[PDB]
């Protein structure tokens, strides 16, 4: 429901840095940056949105001067802001549906500073470093004008064009596929029944081990993992007493199955 | 204090079937030293030509990477995903459970 850009500046040593810029729409990725050519790489045909061919170049130039100036203030202020090698810097910025605009920064995995309204504000827990860092970021007022212009105006008018052009790819439906298998036994005289599911899109699913119409409540539903093609994966396990298990089944409900649940029946041989 | 150990998850896109091509996915999530050696192993040897996704982070600024490769499993071949990292005394090896 939100589109955000991330920036990952990793300073492994004094002469070793790697900054990665990527544009994401919630879970899937839609843009990438290439400092080798200093251009924005569109990952999908629709990923250009409803924006002009010209102002896209105006954005990629604004980005390249912003990423090059930013990625070099650090190691000039490394001693200044007491940054300890090695260290990491992370930034997230974007907007949501319908229209809150956010921008946050992280130093060494923790919340360091944030941008609110038209200024940089330190997190109270972050200490005095953030105040110093906020002051150096608050120095040049043109940048914070440019930043606030992006977050308030460009982000909503872009995400509207992006979601519209991605409608065929956002609400596309891919049917799942399931297979049962054996898992690591949870103890003595106990088996583990595993029900893998893969290939479904979107993420919303329903998976549970069954006994007729009685949902076996001891069903352990795992995390939803990607598969590098836009689909997902999920394994659900269940522990039984080496018996009274040959009558168990795994039922799958998804928005792509059109109301016909996938059902698989355990054999055990 | 701010050193997080990655979560390693191994899975296959399709059901295992000897002779048919498939995809093997290893998923490292939940770490913030942010520099790590993810390697897929086929019968012990390092698998080459392993493609990944572009690195990113989650809400708690914790890093996750997806590494995948295509392969044809056999009956005598066993595979694993080996991870080397700051927060690891020895490389952590996670095997692929095939029934």
């Amino acid at each position: 429901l939100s589109f955000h850009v991330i920036w990952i500046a990793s300073f492994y040593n004094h002469s070793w840095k790697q900054n990665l810029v990527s544009g994401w729409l919630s879970d899937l990725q839609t843009h990438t940056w290439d400092s080798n050519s200093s251009t924005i790489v569109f990952l999908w045909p629709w990923s250009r949105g409803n924006f002009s061919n010209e102002e896209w170049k105006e954005l990629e130039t604004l980005f390249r001067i912003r990423t090059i100036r930013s990625f070099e203030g650090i190691r000039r202020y490394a001693h200044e802001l007491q940054f300890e090698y090695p260290f990491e810097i992370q930034v997230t910025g974007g907007c949501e549906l319908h229209s809150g605009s956010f921008l946050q920064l992280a130093y060494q995995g923790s919340d360091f500073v944030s941008f609110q309204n038209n200024s940089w504000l330190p997190y109270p827990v972050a200490g005095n470093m953030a105040k110093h860092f906020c002051k150096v970021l608050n120095q040049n007022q043109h940048e914070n004008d440019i930043t606030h212009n992006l977050l308030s105006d460009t982000c909503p008018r872009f995400i509207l064009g992006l979601l519209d052009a991605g409608k065929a790819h956002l609400q596309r439906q891919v049917k799942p596929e399931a297979w049962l298998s054996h898992g690591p036994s949870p103890g003595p005289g106990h088996l583990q029944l595993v029900c893998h599911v893969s290939g479904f899109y979107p993420k919303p699913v329903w998976v549970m081990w069954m006994r007729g119409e009685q949902e076996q409540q001891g069903t352990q539903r795992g995390d939803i993992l990607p598969s590098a093609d836009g689909t997902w994966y999920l394994r659900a396990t269940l522990e039984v007493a080496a018996g009274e298990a040959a009558d168990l089944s795994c039922r799958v409900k998804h928005s792509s199955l059109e109301g016909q649940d996938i059902v698989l029946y355990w054999e055990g041989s | 204090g701010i050193q997080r150990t990655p979560k390693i998850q191994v899975y296959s896109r399709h059901p295992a079937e000897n002779g048919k091509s498939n995809f093997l996915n290893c998923y490292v999530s939940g770490f913030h030293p942010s520099d790590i050696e993810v390697d897929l192993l086929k019968n012990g040897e390092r698998i080459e030509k392993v493609e990944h996704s572009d690195l990113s982070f989650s809400k708690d600024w914790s890093f996750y990477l997806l590494y995948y490769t295509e392969f044809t499993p056999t009956e005598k071949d066993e595979y694993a995903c080996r991870v080397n990292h700051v927060t690891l005394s020895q490389p952590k090896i996670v095997k692929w459970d095939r029934d």
Partner: T-cell receptor, first 109, second 111 residues
Framework: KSVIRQTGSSAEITCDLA??????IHWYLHQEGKAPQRLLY??????????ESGISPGKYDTYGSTRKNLRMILRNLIENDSGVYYC???????????FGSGTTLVVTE | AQKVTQAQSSVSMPVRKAVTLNCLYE???????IFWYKQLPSKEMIFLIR?????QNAKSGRYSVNFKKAAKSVALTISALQLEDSAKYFC????????????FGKGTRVT
């Protein structure tokens, strides 16, 4: 190879490297009895001169715009910062860090 | 977060013999080389041998290394001793993935 200077003045050390297999170049200081440490490194691709740890900024500068003829100037000398000064750069393979000749610098009141 | 030191400061061995120089390192890295260098009395510095991490035992010509990665120790074993190779020696260490500065020992003078 040998430079003598008084306290408070300036000094420029010119170091030599075998042709140029040069990317980033590092400067090391060697004192007998102690251990050699790096003071600063020069990135020619952006003229970046960043110090290291608790080294006073501005005390050391480098501008040699040549692979083999490269200079480092250290200013406001004291009786302490006297010793051998090396220039080093890594190989193309990054397997071996090749060092220069070394200039002996002595400082007296 | 690394440290490298050497114990002995000055030693002497018979000509045409075998001698060693130990080095201790406390490192928090999983990929790194450690090298040995030769400081001539004329301040010239020369590379000798490169090893580290899981890279077997390096014997790149008339000189080997005793590698104890579990105990974090490396010893430069120089056999077929030459009277000519009588100088100072320094123990260095650096990162593998991101090669940068080296951390040296206090030196081992050889006569």
């Amino acid at each position: 190879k040998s430079v003598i200077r008084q306290t408070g003045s300036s000094a420029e050390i010119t170091c030599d490297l075998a042709e140029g297999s040069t990317g980033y170049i590092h400067w090391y200081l060697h004192q007998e009895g102690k251990a050699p440490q790096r003071l600063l490194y020069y990135d020619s691709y952006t003229s970046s001169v960043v110090l290291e740890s608790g080294i006073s900024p501005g005390k050391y500068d480098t501008y040699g715009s040549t692979r083999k003829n490269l200079r480092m100037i250290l200013r406001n000398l004291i009786e302490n910062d006297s010793g051998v000064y090396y220039c080093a750069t890594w190989d193309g393979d990054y397997y071996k860090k090749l060092f220069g000749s070394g200039t002996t610098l002595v400082v007296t009141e | 977060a690394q440290k490298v030191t050497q114990a002995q400061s000055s030693v002497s061995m018979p000509v045409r013999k075998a001698v060693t120089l130990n080095c201790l390192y406390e490192t928090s890295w999983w990929s790194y080389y450690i090298f040995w260098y030769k400081q001539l009395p004329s301040k010239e510095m020369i590379f000798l041998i490169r090893q580290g991490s899981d890279e077997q035992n390096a014997k790149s010509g008339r000189y080997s290394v005793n590698f104890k990665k579990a105990a974090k120790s490396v010893a430069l074993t120089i056999s077929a001793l030459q009277l000519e190779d009588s100088a100072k020696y320094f123990c260095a260490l650096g990162e593998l993935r991101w090669p940068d500065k080296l951390i040296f020992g206090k030196g081992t003078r050889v006569t």
